């Protein structure tokens, strides 16, 4: 990534930080996966595990040509009122190894029992008894509040931050920005 | 000359509930007969009809006037002194500054709280109803106009003059606000939550009157310390719910109560900005004294 674009979310009284960042992530998801591109990635420079927050600013790590069209796109724009966005800047030569990822697991015994009974044609009791209380697992990492048709209340967003390494392997990222199995430049 | 234990000021610029409906941007020209948005169950969420890309919000606004005029006051001397100070302020300078700021808020989509977020095009049309007829209309664009920045415009100036006249008591003023926001097909609106229960009138979703009047009065931009946040809804003690921090603390001299007490009893004229803030607070109304 030869150009780094730093999008700083400006504080606003009308909306909270969590809702604003959720809107930002949602808007970016459609602006990156649908738009295409070989490598599309962003990182949270303010990420801290003490407060369990997602950071007060975001950094989109992409190429120079990729960022040139990303900011100009209408979808990715228009939110300049609440967020301060600059232009691409060359990242510092020293860089750490960090991979941002998402944790996928189900915390509901019902989903597992239904999925099992709808495949092997089991009974209601067979699926209920087969799912014990030790089968309910969910990520405990910091999860930003994203409210959508999935959950009425604030729903957690599972984001896994990769440990710091020396060797940094780049490559193509996901569409919604999920980890594709490689780290990203950490500045 | 102590203060009056009983003080009340009737609110001015009091809006009504804000109804919501759905339609298409093409149909914006003639919003009549637009189907309303009905609450549904899943918790409860409200989404536009299957084929609808534009949201409509309609709420009226009245200008009563006589902001400084107290509804109830224990002492006559205090009331007269207050009225004199208010008259002096009006004579020196008119409400054109407040009217202009209010005009900007109405032009932009600041009233809408969450629906505007992620809104590509918001078109507002503010009419003027006199004797049942539309005397003069105006059409603005919320997206192009800065939400946190105040810019001068001919239409805005004319609207500010009309509002200033109404507040001064020249004549009755009625404003019909209509907003159109492009979100997307099957998107989810964010109405005012009720104590999840969504606010609904006549089996139609809407937004609370106070929730709109709170945003319309975001005129507090003179706080002692600025971190770049922008205008804060005019409130005593400059309190902010979302930020969880209270600016314009009582320790300083910028406090509303302190400023009013000094400017009335002690005849200490505060900065012009503070005078505007005090007039805005009086317009909002409340309970003072003891």
From Swiss-Prot, chain A:
Listed transmembrane segments: none
Keywords (A to Z) from UniProt: Antiviral defense, Endonuclease, Hydrolase, Nuclease, RNA-binding
GO molecular-function term, one example from the UniProt record: RNA binding
Function: CRISPR (clustered regularly interspaced short palindromic repeat) is an adaptive immune system that provides protection against mobile genetic elements (viruses, transposable elements and conjugative plasmids). CRISPR clusters contain sequences complementary to antecedent mobile elements and target invading nucleic acids. CRISPR clusters are transcribed and processed into CRISPR RNA (crRNA). Processes pre-crRNA into individual crRNA units. Absolutely required for crRNA production or stability.
Protein name (Swiss-Prot/TrEMBL): CRISPR-associated endonuclease Cas6/Csy4
Complex formation: Part of the Csy ribonucleoprotein complex with a probable stoichiometry of Csy1(1),Csy2(1),Csy3(6),Cas6/Csy4(1)-crRNA(1). A Csy3(6),Cas6/Csy4(1)-crRNA(1) subcomplex is also formed.
Outcome after substituting residue 104 to A: No loss of pre-crRNA cleavage, still binds crRNA
Gene: cas6f
GO terms for biological process, alphabetical: defense response to virus; maintenance of CRISPR repeat elements
Domain of life: Bacteria
Effect seen on changing residue 151 to A: Cleaves pre-crRNA 380-fold slower
């Amino acid at each position: 990534m030869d150009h780094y674009l730093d999008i700083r979310l400006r504080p606003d009284p009308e909306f909270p930080p969590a809702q604003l960042m959720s809107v930002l992530f949602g808007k970016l998801h459609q602006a990156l996966v649908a738009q295409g591109g070989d490598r599309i990635g962003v990182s949270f420079p303010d990420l801290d595990e003490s407060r369990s927050r997602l950071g007060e600013r975001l950094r989109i790590h992409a190429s120079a040509d990729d960022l040139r069209a990303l900011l100009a796109r209408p979808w990715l724009e228009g939110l300049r009122d609440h967020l301060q966005f600059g232009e691409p800047a060359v990242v510092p030569h020293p860089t750490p190894y960090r991979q941002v990822s998402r944790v996928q697991a189900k915390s509901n015994p019902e989903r597992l029992r239904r999925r099992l009974m709808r495949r092997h044609d089991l009974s209601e009791e067979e699926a209920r008894k087969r799912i014990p209380d030790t089968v309910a697992r969910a990520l405990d990492l910091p999860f930003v509040t994203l409210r959508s048709q999935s959950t009425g209340q604030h729903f957690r967003l599972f984001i896994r931050h990769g440990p710091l390494q020396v060797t940094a392997e780049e490559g193509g990222f996901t569409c919604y920005g999920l980890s594709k199995g490689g780290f990203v430049p950490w500045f | 000359l102590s203060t009056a234990s009983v003080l009340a000021f009737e609110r001015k610029l009091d809006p009504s509930d804000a109804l919501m409906s759905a339609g298409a941007w093409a149909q914006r020209d003639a919003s009549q007969e637009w189907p309303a948005v009905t609450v549904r169950e899943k918790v409860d969420v409200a989404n536009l009809p299957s084929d609808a890309d534009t949201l409509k919000v309609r709420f009226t606004l009245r200008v009563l006037g006589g902001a400084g005029t107290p509804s109830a006051c224990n002492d006559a001397a205090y009331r007269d002194k207050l009225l004199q100070t208010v008259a002096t302020y009006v004579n020196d300078q008119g409400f054109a500054e407040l009217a202009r700021r209010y005009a900007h808020n109405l032009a932009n989509a600041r009233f809408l709280w969450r629906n505007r977020v992620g809104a590509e095009a918001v078109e507002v049309r503010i009419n003027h109803i006199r004797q049942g007829e539309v005397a003069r209309a105006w059409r603005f664009d919320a997206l192009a106009i800065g939400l946190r920045d105040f810019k001068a415009d001919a239409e805005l100036d004319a609207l500010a003059e009309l509002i200033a006249s109404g507040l001064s008591g020249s004549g009755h003023v009625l404003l019909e606000v209509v907003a159109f926001a492009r979100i997307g097909d099957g998107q989810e609106v964010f109405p005012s939550q009720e104590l999840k229960t969504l606010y609904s009138v006549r089996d139609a979703a809407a937004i609370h009157s106070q929730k709109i009047g709170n945003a319309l009065r975001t005129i507090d931009t003179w706080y002692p310390d600025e971190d770049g946040l922008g205008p804060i809804a005019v409130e005593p003690y400059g309190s902010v719910t979302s930020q969880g921090k209270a600016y314009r603390q009582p320790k300083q001299k910028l406090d509303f109560y302190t400023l009013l007490d000094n400017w009335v009893l002690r005849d200490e004229a505060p900065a012009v900005e503070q005078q505007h803030y005090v007039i805005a607070n009086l317009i909002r109304g409340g309970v003072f004294g003891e």
